[PDB]
Design a protein around this ligand. Structure first.
Ligand code: SCK
Ligand code: SCK
Ligand code: SCK
Ligand code: SCK
Lengths: 533, 536
């Protein structure tokens, strides 16, 4: 019995496991329950805290993945499979994971809490790209990750109902945050220095905690990678949530109480079987069950809340990858595949814009087509294929990030912004997709430090830089290394100067204006258009 | 005669003429100035098509420029060369339908390609007698035969009650056409070749050239065309019949007149100055780069809108040279956008930019206007008053000249034309407008006409070499339909503009440089998106 691996939390005693990182050992405490299993009558309900347990609880292995859709597009292909469940699926899934240095930190240590993405319909904290041992070992971080409910189980809402009030997967996250406040000191973490970080739906999630008061007392700084609470996909109105839940109910054969009662009788997979039959249009970058503007967790729309918020004592790191849109084109737009170069026709480009901007009127779609067409090379298939990716990336991620970045800065936040431009040498998706959505994550987590993964030396040194920016941000709210004059400074993003940095193999470069002209189109003109069209 | 210069006596259909020997820097040229080509359009003949000149007896003195057609005189900046150079330099009269011919001295031996100039000035102003339209240098240096005509402007040229007998519209264009017919019948007497006639014009003059391309009866009267900083398509060059009627009727009210016969009869009693004095009160909006009396779509001279005619025309037989100056819009800002002056740097606020967009795009709805502001804003520096000033200039230049030209060039090339395109980017060293205006609308003309060859005008040496190059491109185009020198083969070539490659050339003090796409992205906004906005 190794006493570094024995921890007493409020609910009782835990035994972790010593893991091998390249540089030395780390302590891992995996599969720690933070809620009563949300099963049976508890399906669609807010989480309750985990009852205390007897003896020593085994925290040496990852727990089950929350019940979710499993991708079939390309069976056996790493590029897709690396996001799929790597443990058994279960509704009993509300567990979290802590990595700390071994031996446990001598003094209170800043805590990073990771919130995974997956369109709010998928994901797990157990995926290889979310492995906390490298940050723990190399930077001395205390790293936490939690499972939260996805799909119908986390986000099916009959707004105003007692029994499916909405947003319960966000409440799972909040409960894990409260758990860290109450317990993390036992592991050597500092509950007074907690930084949330997440990517895509997880970044959206972090943003929603920024915009929901009860969560604000549970963390100090935030990182939003390739996602925002504002924007076209991260939330639905109460009326639309109700529509989709009643449609799903109808499709599985089901007074809210009577309707939800019958949904609870249904096997998990029966619900997943009809998850993708409830969206209003043929779309990509659109998810059926997502956070709802309930007037409770979210008191108003994210837009309203970011415009009117006071963000004075907040620090935020935000950014995007170079090719946010490409990944999504192969899941919906005719002409696109990982197995060819996806050179497309102009006709195919117009059709793809209707699918990528599903809420666009005929005229708005035309405006999108006209803005993104290169009028020097209007029928060039390479240009049209890349234009399609940009439409999707800009509309869904880049322009929402620019918007958020600017509102936070204007309203007193300390903001830092990046664009991530390195394509991993070991990437299995084709070259045309460039640096796709999700593919900075393996670098921030420091996976290239594992020599068995076959990254280059240059990538390892890069990963080390990124780990430093992130953990320095966690420590001080400023990604800049205070043990460095030599390396170029990362300036705060401001609405005036609009400075952001490029994260790539070359040293930091400072740039101005995150797609400024194109995002004025999406952020300023299109709204005016359709609030008139 | 007996003691007169025998090389200055020429006969035309209407009778004998006596011209004058003028000095060009390189040597003498022959000028026949003030040749009547129509009966004076005065009295009962105001607003009516021109009738051809009845023959005169004896020798008509053709040694001085004749009257300028009755028109508005600019007094925005009295005594200032930049404005006065465009103002009338002879007496204003409704008796003004005269033309001018410059030829080599002695007159050429064999039939010589002819250039016909059509002036601009908003269809409300201009004269063939202005110094910048002096044909002596082209005639002497290139051996050209050059012809310029006065044509009626403003109400006199363009006021219309469409469908009427007494004011059918487009009579100023018919003035131009009669001058073209005159050239066909008479130019051989001067040594010109009526089988090689190239029209060229700037601004409203270029729009006029384009309307002759689009009007069948005009097309037998020339072979090739140059359109400088203007087009028949676009927001200003024409009005609909209903809009012409409304403007004509309002003007009649304003001067104390209101059945068409009766209304026109009463207009014909008004002093010409009374019409000019009320001419600017009939525009539908507060505006710049809009003119009250312009060509009307009458279903006669213009059988359909120019937009429709360029979309469906067959232009296989056509060779055209078209282009724009670097800063088409700047000139117009000082005539009505608050914040703008020739006497300061005209740095404006963002509020002043939105107000200026409404004046510069007066037909635009609120949504259209914000589309324009959003497109033209620099979102890295959305309140920089230097960018905002230059954006205002670009808005007006792009909307009225650059994108209409881009579109004209595109359609003509698609429909069979041989098109050559330029941007003119040299600012005259002697320009009296402020530096912020750049290369303003109309400031290429003095170079094409070769004024820098006159050393008394104080242009630089480089400017003189430059003018000689331009004169060569223009006259080579007149001669052959191709601006390229057939026996210079070392100097960089000017390729035709095509829809595929969208090639055009920079005209400046450096050797020709080929560029691609004439404001391709921005012109897609004006030419494709804004229209679609309108349709709902
Ligand atoms: C099918 N399954 C869901 C049960 C396991 C999927 O396996 C992986 O992709 C794990 C390896 C992985 O994460 O791939 C990316 C590794 N990388 C980025 C270091 C190359
Ligand atoms: C976490 N990650 C975002 C980095 C990987 C997500 O990958 C996707 O499948 C994105 C494409 C997508 O959302 O497709 C939905 C497929 N559908 C409709 C079958 C569920
Ligand atoms: C007063 N007026 C209306 C009777 C005549 C105005 O005179 C001029 O501006 C003639 C000078 C001129 O055309 O100068 C501009 C061209 N440049 C630079 C070659 C002299
Ligand atoms: C070179 N050019 C003769 C072709 C144009 C220069 O003349 C102008 O006045 C341009 C500005 C303008 O058109 O103002 C008209 C408005 N008005 C009549 C009220 C002065």
């Amino acid at each position: 019995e190794d006493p570094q691996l024995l921890v007493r939390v409020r609910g009782g005693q835990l035994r972790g496991i010593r893991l091998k990182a390249p540089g030395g050992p780390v302590s891992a405490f995996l599969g720690i329950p933070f809620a009563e299993p949300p099963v049976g009558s508890r399906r669609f309900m807010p989480p309750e805290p985990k009852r205390p347990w007897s003896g020593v609880l085994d925290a040496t292995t990852f727990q089950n993945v929350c019940y979710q859709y499993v991708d079939t597009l390309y069976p056996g292909f790493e590029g897709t499979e690396m996001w799929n469940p790597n443990r058994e699926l279960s509704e009993d899934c509300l567990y979290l994971n802590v990595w700390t240095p071994y031996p446990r930190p001598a003094s209170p240590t800043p805590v990073l809490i990771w919130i995974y993405g997956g369109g709010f319909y998928s994901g797990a904290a157990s995926l290889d790209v979310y492995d906390g041992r490298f940050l723990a070992q190399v930077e001395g971080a205390v790293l936490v990750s939690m499972n939260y409910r996805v799909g119908t189980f986390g986000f099916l809402a009959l707004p105003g109902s007692r029994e499916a009030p909405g947003n319960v997967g966000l409440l799972d996250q909040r409960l894990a945050l409260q758990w860290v406040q109450e317990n993390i000191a036992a592991f050597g973490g500092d509950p007074m220095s907690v930084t949330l970080f997440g990517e895509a739906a997880g970044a959206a999630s972090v943003g929603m905690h920024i915009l929901s008061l009860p969560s604000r007392s549970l963390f100090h700084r935030a990182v939003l990678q390739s996602g925002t609470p504002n924007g076209p996909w991260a939330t639905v109105s109460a009326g639309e949530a109700r529509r989709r839940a009643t449609l799903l109910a109808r499709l599985v054969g089901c007074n809210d109480t009577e309707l939800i009662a019958c949904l609870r009788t249904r096997p998990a997979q029966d619900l997943v079987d009809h998850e993708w039959h409830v969206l209003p249009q043929e779309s990509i970058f659109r998810f059926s069950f997502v956070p709802v503007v309930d007037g409770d967790f979210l008191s108003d729309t994210p837009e309203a809340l970011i415009n009117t918020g006071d963000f004075q004592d907040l620090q935020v790191l935000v950014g995007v990858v170079k090719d946010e849109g490409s990944y999504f084109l192969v899941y919906g737009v005719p002409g696109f595949s990982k197995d060819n170069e996806s050179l497309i026709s102009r006709a195919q480009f117009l059709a793809g814009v209707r699918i990528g901007v599903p809420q666009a009127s005929d005229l708005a779609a035309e405006a999108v087509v006209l803005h993104y067409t290169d009028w020097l090379h209007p029928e060039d298939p390479t240009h049209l294929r890349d234009a399609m990716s940009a439409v999707v990336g800009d509309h869904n991620v880049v322009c929402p990030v620019a918007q958020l970045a600017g509102r936070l800065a204007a309203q007193g936040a300390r903001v830092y912004a990046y664009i991530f431009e390195h394509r991993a040498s070991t990437l299995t998706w084709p070259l045309w997709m460039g640096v796709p959505h999700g593919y900075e994550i393996e670098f921030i987590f420091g996976l290239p430090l594992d020599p068995s993964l076959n990254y280059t030396t240059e990538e390892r040194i890069f990963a080390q830089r990124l780990m430093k920016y992130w953990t320095n941000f966690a420590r001080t709210g400023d990604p800049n290394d205070p043990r460095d004059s030599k390396s170029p400074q990362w300036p705060p993003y401001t609405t005036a100067a609009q400075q952001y940095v490029s994260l790539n193999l070359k040293p930091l470069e400072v740039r101005r204006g995150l797609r400024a002209q194109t995002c004025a189109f999406w952020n300023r003109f299109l709204p005016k258009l359709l609030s008139a069209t």
